[PDB]
Amino acid sequence: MQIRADFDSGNIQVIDASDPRRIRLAIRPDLASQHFQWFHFKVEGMAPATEHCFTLVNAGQSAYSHAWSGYQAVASYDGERWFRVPSQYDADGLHFQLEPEESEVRFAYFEPYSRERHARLVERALGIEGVERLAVGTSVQGRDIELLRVRRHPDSHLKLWVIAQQHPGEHMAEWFMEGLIERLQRPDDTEMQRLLEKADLYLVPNMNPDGAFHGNLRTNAAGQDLNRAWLEPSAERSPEVWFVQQEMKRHGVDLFLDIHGDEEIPHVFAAGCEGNPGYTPRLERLEQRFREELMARGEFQIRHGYPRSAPGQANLALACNFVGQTYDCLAFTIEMPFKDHDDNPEPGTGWSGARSKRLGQDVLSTLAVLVDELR
Ligand SMILES: N=C(N)NCCS[C@@H](CC(=O)O)C(=O)O
Numbered sequence: 001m002q003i004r005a006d007f008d009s010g011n012i013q014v015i016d017a018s019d020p021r022r023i024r025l026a027i028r029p030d031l032a033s034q035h036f037q038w039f040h041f042k043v044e045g046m047a048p049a050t051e052h053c054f055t056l057v058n059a060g061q062s063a064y065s066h067a068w069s070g071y072q073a074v075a076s077y078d079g080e081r082w083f084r085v086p087s088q089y090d091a092d093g094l095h096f097q098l099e100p101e102e103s104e105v106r107f108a109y110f111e112p113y114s115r116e117r118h119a120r121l122v123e124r125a126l127g128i129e130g131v132e133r134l135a136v137g138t139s140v141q142g143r144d145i146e147l148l149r150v151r152r153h154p155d156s157h158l159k160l161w162v163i164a165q166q167h168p169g170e171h172m173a174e175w176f177m178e179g180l181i182e183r184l185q186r187p188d189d190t191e192m193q194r195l196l197e198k199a200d201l202y203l204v205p206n207m208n209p210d211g212a213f214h215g216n217l218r219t220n221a222a223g224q225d226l227n228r229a230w231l232e233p234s235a236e237r238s239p240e241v242w243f244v245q246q247e248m249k250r251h252g253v254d255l256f257l258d259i260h261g262d263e264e265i266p267h268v269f270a271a272g273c274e275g276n277p278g279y280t281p282r283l284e285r286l287e288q289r290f291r292e293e294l295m296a297r298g299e300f301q302i303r304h305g306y307p308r309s310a311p312g313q314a315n316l317a318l319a320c321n322f323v324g325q326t327y328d329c330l331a332f333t334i335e336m337p338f339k340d341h342d343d344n345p346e347p348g349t350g351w352s353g354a355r356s357k358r359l360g361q362d363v364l365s366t367l368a369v370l371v372d373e374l375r
């Protein structure tokens, strides 16, 4: 058989694939940083009625190695239908098995979102009523960072910002954006009519095109963790973030959602700004309102997530905290799992692109209810 990762978001190093029950592979570190966890490769020429056993030998050295426990790898014969496969984790690494029904199959850490799909999403968005490309940034390697604006009423006053995938390996993030944008196509959507009569949406489908294309997990091309560059952005080292901050300064922000994915926690959740020195009772209540309304509508919960920050101990280098404090607006880091959303088990696919898309649509419903309370 032959294994390769010479394509968009591909990531893998082949050690030995001469024995179907002893396939050995290694995950490749980011272009310019030590991080790694995301993997994506294709296998071709597999024999029929044959059990194939894979091992990612260096999983123990990954960025979040403790997150491998309970994680099931994703696979697909066509690149459209993705399914989970039996996986285990021990000192030897991550292992997964499959008796392929076809001669070729792909494996990935999560259902991938290619830049080609990104182009299609942008093309689709600009064909929707009220949608325009407000601005465009440039990544370290010269790829577009589109900023889309949804404005259907020339007298609205609120600016709701949603950006995604600052960390390239968190592909569920742009899937979330696809769901959000596709909902805008609906001819008769009363909730969106109400929301857009009072607010415009500022959307950034992908914050790290270089990292995504190169199959990176954490950093942009220059090796910078974009979500640690908000306190001191650079047009040279973190142009992706520098771009967004300039646009925010000019248009204003009344809501900010930073879409991410968490390797360890098998639950969808949101991390707020309770650690901000600028945190206020107003924001405390708004965060409560958002979580409650979203939990009542989508696959979202509150018990599991990151620990809350002690008063005034937040790291302002993170987008959620920086934007929330700089603009005194409701702000959250939305986190979807690489595993499953255990509250609603669907083992066959675990968390997926489709469920990510749905969460995006349910978030829109939540914003529609809270619009009059944002300011
Ligand atoms: N409150 C913290 N420290 N993180 C939550 C926001 S995103 C976070 C997790 C993620 O990357 O998904 C990160 O930027 O590392």
Ligand SMILES: [Zn+2]
Pocket: 166, 167, 170, 260, 261
């Ligand atoms: Zn992230």
